[PDB]
Design a protein around this ligand. Structure first.
Ligand SMILES: Nc1ncnc2c1ncn2[C@@H]1O[C@H](COP(=O)(O)OP(=O)(O)O)[C@@H](O)[C@H]1O
Lengths: 97, 291, 290, 330, 322, 49, 319, 48
């Protein structure tokens, strides 16, 4: 659900580890829509981490996850592995895709 | 209940049938017919005739399975422990969940729900059952024979009536979701009020109103609606025939509206009752004003 | 009504019509969505206060004894069993049910328990509304003239009815013969002279109605086209479920084409303005709808 | 009906024709989202917007709080993929009906075209349908309107030509989808995201090659880099058929070469049997946009490289289909 | 006048007296320089505390008015009365825009959430109810109190509500999920009044009780409760522990609150006195013979140095602070 | 509903709240606590033994 | 303040079945009390014009009513020869002192709040104790019907006007008429003294010279049925200036709370507010369709009330 | 004093079992729930 996925994202971002989420379409479609928000937040945090004007001496990059400010390590990434050929699997919303 | 009723042949037949069912052990009723046909009122009247206590669950928006379980527990305690004759009137609209149907299935068939009581409330049930066994003159100590006595008392005392509208697909689905409903219940098909019933209701209700026209000419081609209408109809008989025709006209109008694809609202006997009441009031008012 | 009315008004005009009718009786508006609906219902039942309840699609079955009038009379008191408690049902109590969804389905029992009152938009009513709107927008003086004269005719007809009723009452309350008491003759003469004055006033208001309608005849095709366009909009829902348009949508289109028209900045000719208004009505309707 | 081949002007419609009480329902066919459009709208109007994705109970809480804040502060609220909560949609409509918001308040409800969306909500708000642009010209217009003017007009003067070529390729590819067995092998999701990735790739490689110089040689443009990246990652990523990949490679090699900078370059060949599409000679954004707006109204699948008869039966169906709609609403 | 240290002084500024019945509660307008006081004669009289002149009476309640409260903007006034109704007053035009029923018995408290979109009320039927400001619909019903609930007061951020009752306990509830976060019971008699702790006081409280600094940085919301056992207990909501007990009142404590600067505790009691407590040393600094009869409520202005106190003697008094 | 009760020599100690009239106003006007039930006293009521 | 009544009314209270004789204001509450000729004293909420209650103890027509400083007691007189004292907390008569033969016209509680003055047709003014009810001292010297009586601001000096054309000021301790004034053209009906805040405003209004003590001295005013309103000095007994312009018989006079204008009612169906220091304001405002009987000015609120023979009490805003 | 007043509601059918149940209720409230209770009873309530 939203809470478990958010907690996993918090762990991945704090560690700085890659998240390979296999069978991502097995989630409920509403839960996919909700998770899209956290994925977008992580991606925008990484994007503004990547800009040249950022300096490591300044405040560390943080993101809003589950109503907390969590530092996002540059090394983390989110990977979803899916098989769209199975009937009954949820369809990812466009804002997530 | 201070609500007037119009008596005709079908009402007498139906109250006789309900009285027959209410006098048998483990006698349950499955009334099927259009809403507003008097099923609930007739059931309450017959229960009052036979000394049964009418119980209805007060369903609302926040009603859930636990409330239904509590109501069932109260009814079973009153029926078995207190040895009270109770008529459990329940409607299809009261069924908000399949758990409701499961509980009703078990209660109708076995006469008891195996695990409706646990813990402290099971102890309370056992104490009440012990008190009832003492009251009747029976000597029961252990829990199993007390529960057997409670089940026997519930079987002998509790009567359950389900009233529901005649939906064919709904009927087929209920034939499998609640099998006991078609085995442990006596199915009465009230249906809609017949043409004869409408004619009798109109005649009896408008008997007070004048509707007398000695110089009334019977048309050569009388648009007969009630089959048993006397061949030389009077003015009053013609008026009642016209009222029945109006009701059937509404039925055909809804039929054609649904056929074209529009949205329809079901016509009930209460529509006919409102129609005749309006006719009486308007007739009286217009006559008074004109005079 | 015998059964308590259930009103279906997407526009909501029936709602404040009901409020205005029962304002003097202190009518209370509530909803099934409110958790305190039981308290308001029992207060209205006890004190006989008119009640209006919205969002009937969330109907609370607790109203079943009230709608079925399952009252029990004892000791001169009419007890109604609301849930598990008894309340003395005041004879002045009345309840109205309202919803804004014309397409909502209802269970057959609720349909049996209530008298349905549907406030649909007819072609004639929409034509009249559009004609009044265009008259106000283009010829405000004619619009206010028509409003004042409708008020005047209402007052004059009420006065004529009152005078006729008072004349009948006077001729019916005489204790003897007319000429025995002169005050009767005074009253009859006064009533007759007032009737003559109101009749001449009605005649002059009628001729000014004649001129008002003969200047209003020019805009009738626009109102007919407006009604036709709106009903085509309503029929659009037959080809795709997404094509749901309300009367307020068409009225906003009409307001935009009338007042917010960029093609009416420098045009003053009434015929030219009418032609521009019609053309831009069609254009704006197609643009917004499509 | 000319207004409708133009890109949608959300700015004017939201500013003027939409009351604050009326939600902006934004229904899109599958493969399209409208979140980006209104996010850009809020960005260019400097209006704060709170975006919430529906699907969680705390999502509903955050929604209700955001609407409660914005109806007083006058800010904007987005609720995306609201078609997954029809009952909550009914509750939201009921809440919206009895509400007197700030004059600047705006609510956007992004959904796909779904039969489960409540009717009363649809009647409550104003509906906008987002779908593939009707024609190649319309698709070019939408692409050029979406991309900011300053983004195209950068230091290299060839960037505008590359952007026009990319827009034409996107339009051709996306319009080939209307003809499912012929244009491709299946309904691929060639959408705005692929276009944005392609634009970013073009910008990155052009900046890498042209070190801020005002002009660069047409042969010095990294044609191979762009061709491979589109064929493998950007537009070839969704391709799972060998022959679809071959067709994509054919289009990329026909378009993305130095010959595209020739004055006589032919975008299409013999569209009507005699005339063919000629590549614009302009070097700036405005010239390309004007050329796009000057395109003929008549469009045929020969613009896409498909046979001219490929649109016959489909059109016939729509024709018959059109009659069926007229004969159903008389 | 140290801008965070003034305390009231025995010389009163004005003794406003227009009420025909005991004055129940007195509140300050958050924005305007005006003050409001409800009484038991079903009246809500509005006074200007700078010049001490009556302005206007708000009426419409049938029975005694028990609580009045403002929103953040000061544009709406929520009041509750003994007639089982809660009225919302448009403070600009001074008309009751909405009346709310639903409480089964006397409504003894009312408060508007900080967001300004909800109204929380507590009534003698042992229930707390939440009402929408816009629609006036009851949306949530906090149950769990075993007796008459006397007051309800939300915190600064509006995520928690505290309720005192005749059931000897103070219950802290989470508004979002309706659960009972905490149940604080140390008073040996009925709890009358409660109050939350302003942010500017946390650190002070943290060093007043000797509580070590938490690694989170938030000391935890602190609550106060005056009760009829003549004691005022201050609690840590996070841990559920009574940080301290303040003793010295001669009778039931009717109102309690912090100094706006969070350095002192202002309280009033039926012993006819208003007391200023130095909770640094857990001892009462100052005592004022405020009224000639029971003191029912007090309010302490956020910025201006004024204290307004109501009483059963039908007199509302303004106190300059020096 | 004025009421007459006979055989007072078998007095039921349930009328003690009614006879002593320890009622409370407000919250429903006149409230009596008959046994465990918070009854609302009707002012027209009167009892004779 | 510059509080001035305005032609538009707020409420025209009509509950009395008989002409209204006097209206007063509660000292602290938002309550106004009106006595009428039907032996009933009605109590109203002037802010919203809502009938509150009625007290029907008196036998004959009630003439004059008066509060105390605290507003907890209400002294009333009537033609039934008796003086009633009303407890204003529960609104029931608590002590009905008798005597003082024939119709009693006026009654007043001097600010000390322990004694009452009363005047009547029997040509004398009696003193009563609130606590006990015993007439302790009787003031004689008026040879005719004493109409209206008022004490000072500290319970030491009393003024009595009568049909005998004489206004007599009496001292509590010495029981002697220190000042007797016989100068009016026709019968004096209404009197009212000056508050503190007005004495200074008199000094430049008349040019009077301060004595050795420097105090201007206590002041009187008397309106007389000869359509003249004359303002007087307690210490000397000499005329300062006269107000003329009332069409008909004057019935009620009092000073503005700010001590700057003069507000008076008269049988001229109109209410007149007049300036005295520079004679600038001469505003005449029609108030009732019939004879206007009495009026009152609120101490702080911007409200005035008028009771008339038309059985109607009217409220005017002040602006 | 904050005490909860408890009186037994006797009637013609009030027996010893009812008194024991009332005693159990009072003791449960006053010993397990830490509730101060003033148990007020009259001589008339002593039927046995
Ligand atoms: N025979 C009858 N004569 C008059 N009224 C009737 C009759 N039967 C039913 N009604 C009306 O129907 C109402 C009760 O309907 P009910 O029995 O609840 O419907 P259902 O049969 O669907 O349960 C009553 O208010 C009564 O007025």
């Amino acid at each position: 659900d939203f809470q478990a996925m958010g907690r996993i994202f918090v762990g991945l971002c704090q560690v700085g580890a890659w998240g390979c989420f296999d069978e991502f379409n097995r989630l409920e479609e509403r839960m996919l829509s909700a998770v899209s928000q956290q994925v977008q937040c992580i991606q925008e945090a990484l994007r503004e981490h990547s800009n040249p004007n950022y300096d490591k001496t300044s405040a560390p990059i943080t993101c809003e996850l589950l109503n907390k400010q969590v530092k996002v390590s540059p090394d983390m990434a989110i990977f979803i592995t899916m098989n769209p050929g199975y009937a009954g699997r949820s369809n990812l919303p466009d804002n997530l895709k | 209940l201070d609500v007037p009723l119009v008596l005709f042949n079908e009402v007498l037949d139906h109250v006789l049938r309900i009285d027959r069912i209410f006098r048998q052990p483990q006698g349950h009723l499955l009334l099927i017919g259009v809403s507003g046909a008097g099923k609930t009122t007739l059931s309450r009247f017959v229960a009052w005739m036979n000394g049964l206590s009418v119980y209805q669950i007060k369903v609302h928006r926040k009603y859930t399975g636990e409330d239904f379980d509590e109501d069932l527990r109260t009814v079973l305690r009153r029926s078995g422990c207190k040895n009270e004759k109770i008529a459990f009137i329940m409607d299809e609209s009261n069924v908000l969940d399949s758990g409701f149907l499961e509980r009703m299935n078990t209660l109708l068939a076995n006469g008891e729900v195996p695990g409706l009581f646990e813990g402290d409330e099971y102890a309370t049930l056992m104490t009440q059952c012990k008190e009832g066994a003492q009251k009747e003159g029976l000597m029961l100590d252990s829990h199993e024979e007390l529960y057997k006595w409670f089940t026997s008392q519930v079987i002998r005392n509790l009567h359950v009536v389900f009233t529901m509208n005649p939906s064919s697909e709904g009927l087929k689905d209920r034939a499998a979701t609640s099998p006991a409903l078609f085995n442990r219940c006596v199915l009465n098909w009230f249906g809609d009020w017949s043409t004869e019933a409408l004619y009798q209701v109109g005649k009896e209700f408008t008997s007070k109103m004048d509707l007398e026209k000695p110089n009334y000419i019977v048309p050569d081609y009388m648009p007969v609606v009630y089959d048993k209408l006397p061949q030389p109809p009077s003015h009053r008989e013609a008026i009642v025939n016209s009222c029945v025709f109006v009701h059937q006209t509404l039925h055909q109008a809804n039929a054609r509206l649904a056929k074209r694809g529009g949205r329809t609202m079901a016509i009930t006997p209460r529509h006919y009752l409102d129609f005749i009441n309006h006719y009486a009031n308007l007739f009286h008012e217009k006559r008074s004003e004109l005079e | 009504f015998n059964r308590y009315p259930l009103i279906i008004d997407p526009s909501g005009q029936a709602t404040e019509f009901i409020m205005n009718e029962y304002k003097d009786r202190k009518i209370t508006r509530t909803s099934f969505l409110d958790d305190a609906f039981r308290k308001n219902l029992e207060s209205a039942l006890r004190f006989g206060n008119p009640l209006l309840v919205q969002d009937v699609e969330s109907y609370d079955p607790v109203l079943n004894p009230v709608l079925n009038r399952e009252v029990r009379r004892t000791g001169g008191r009419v007890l109604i069993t609301l849930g598990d408690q008894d309340i003395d049902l005041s004879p002045s109590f009345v309840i109205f049910l309202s919803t804004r969804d014309p397409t909502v389905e209802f269970p057959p029992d609720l349909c049996s328990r209530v008298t349905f009152v549907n406030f649909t938009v007819t072609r004639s009513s929409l034509q009249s509304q559009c004609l009044n709107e265009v008259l106000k927008a283009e010829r405000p003086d004619v619009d206010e003239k028509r409003s004042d004269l409708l008020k005047l005719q209402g007052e004059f007809q009420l006065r004529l009815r009152q005078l006729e009723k008072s004349l009948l009452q006077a001729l019916n309350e005489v204790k003897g013969r007319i000429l025995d008491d002169d005050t009767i003759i005074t009253t009859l003469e006064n009533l007759k002279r007032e009737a003559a004055e109101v009749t001449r006033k009605v005649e002059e208001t009628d001729i000014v109605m004649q001129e008002v309608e003969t200047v209003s005849q020019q805009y009738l095709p626009l109102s007919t086209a407006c009604s036709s366009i709106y009903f085509t909009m309503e029929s659009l829902k037959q080809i795709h479920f997404l094509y749901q348009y309300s009367l307020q949508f068409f009225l906003d289109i009409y307001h935009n084409v009338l007042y917010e028209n960029p093609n009416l900045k420098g045009v003053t000719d009434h015929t030219q303005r009418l032609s521009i208004i019609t053309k831009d009505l069609f254009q704006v309707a197609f643009n917004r709808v499509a | 009906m000319s207004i409708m081949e133009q890109p949608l002007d959300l700015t004017h419609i939201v500013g003027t024709e939409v009351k604050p009480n009326t939600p902006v329902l934004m229904c899109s066919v599958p493969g399209y989202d409208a979140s980006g459009h209104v996010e850009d709208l809020a960005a260019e109007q400097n209006t704060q917007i709170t975006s919430i994705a529906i699907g969680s109970a705390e999502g509903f809480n955050q929604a209700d709080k955001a609407i409660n804040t914005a109806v007083k502060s006058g800010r904007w609220v987005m609720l995306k993929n609201v078609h997954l909560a029809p009952g909550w949609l009914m509750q939201l409509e009921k809440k919206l009906h009895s509400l007197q918001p700030h004059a600047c308040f705006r609510l956007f409800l992004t959904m796909e075209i779904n039969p489960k969306v409540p009717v009363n909500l649809l009647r409550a708000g104003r509906i906008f349908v987002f779908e593939p642009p009707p024609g190649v010209k319309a698709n070019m217009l939408r692409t050029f309107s979406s991309i900011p003017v300053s983004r195209i007009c950068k230091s290299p003067n060839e960037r505008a030509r590359l952007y026009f070529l990319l827009a034409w390729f996107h339009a051709i590819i996306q319009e080939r989808l209307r003809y499912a067995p012929l244009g491709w092998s299946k309904k691929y999701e060639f959408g705005e995201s692929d276009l944005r990735s392609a634009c970013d790739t073009v910008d990155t490689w052009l900046d890498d090659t042209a070190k801020g110089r005002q002009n660069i040689s047409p042969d010095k443009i990294p044609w191979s880099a762009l061709k491979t990246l589109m064929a493998q990652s950007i537009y070839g990523g969704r391709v799972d058929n060998e022959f679809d990949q071959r067709l994509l490679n054919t289009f990329l090699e026909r378009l993305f070469t130095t010959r595209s900078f020739d004055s006589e370059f032919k975008l299409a060949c013999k569209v009507d049997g005699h005339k063919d599409i000629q590549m614009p000679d302009g070097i700036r954004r405005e010239e390309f946009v004007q050329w796009v707006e000057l395109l003929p109204d008549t469009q045929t699948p020969s613009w896409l490289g498909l046979p001219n008869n490929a649109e016959r039966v489909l059109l016939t169906t729509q024709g018959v289909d059109m009659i069926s709609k007229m004969l159903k609403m008389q | 006048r140290d801008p965070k240290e003034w305390i009231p002084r025995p010389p009163e500024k004005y003794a406003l007296s227009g009420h025909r019945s005991p004055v129940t509660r007195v509140i300050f307008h958050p924005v305007f320089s005006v003050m409001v006081s409800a009484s038991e004669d079903a009246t809500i009289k509005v006074w200007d505390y700078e010049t001490g002149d009556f302005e206007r009476t708000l009426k419409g309640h049938t029975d005694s008015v028990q609580d009045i409260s403002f929103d953040h903007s000061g544009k709406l006034l929520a009041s509750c009365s003994a007639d089982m109704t809660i009225k919302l007053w448009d403070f600009q035009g001074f008309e009751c825009i909405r009346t709310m029923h639903g409480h089964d018995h006397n409504v003894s408290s009312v408060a508007i959430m900080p967001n300004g979109d909800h109204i929380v009320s507590a009534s003698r039927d042992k229930t707390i109810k939440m009402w929408e400001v816009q629609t006036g619909y009851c949306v949530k019903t906090f149950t769990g109190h075993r007796e008459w609930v006397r007051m309800v007061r939300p915190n600064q951020d509006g995520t928690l509500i505290a309720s005192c009752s005749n059931d000897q306990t103070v219950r802290v509830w989470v508004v979002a999920t309706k659960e009972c976060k905490a149940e604080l019971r140390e008073h040996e008699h009925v709890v009358e009044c409660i109050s939350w702790a302003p942010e500017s006081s946390y650190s002070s409280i943290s060093e007043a009780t000797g509580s070590e600094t938490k690694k989170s940085g938030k000391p935890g919301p602190f609550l106060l409760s005056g009760s009829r056992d003549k004691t005022i207990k201050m609690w840590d909501v996070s841990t559920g522990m009574c940080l301290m007990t303040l003793v010295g009142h001669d009778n039931w404590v009717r109102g309690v609150l912090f100094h706006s600067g969070g350095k002192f505790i202002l309280s009033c009691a039926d012993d006819k006195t208003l007391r200023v407590w130095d909770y640094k040393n857990k001892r009462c600094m100052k005592t004022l013979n405020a009224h000639e009869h029971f003191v029912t409520s007090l309010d302490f202005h956020k910025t201006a140095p004024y204290v307004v106190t109501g009483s059963v003697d039908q007199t509302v008094k303004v106190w300059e602070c020096r």
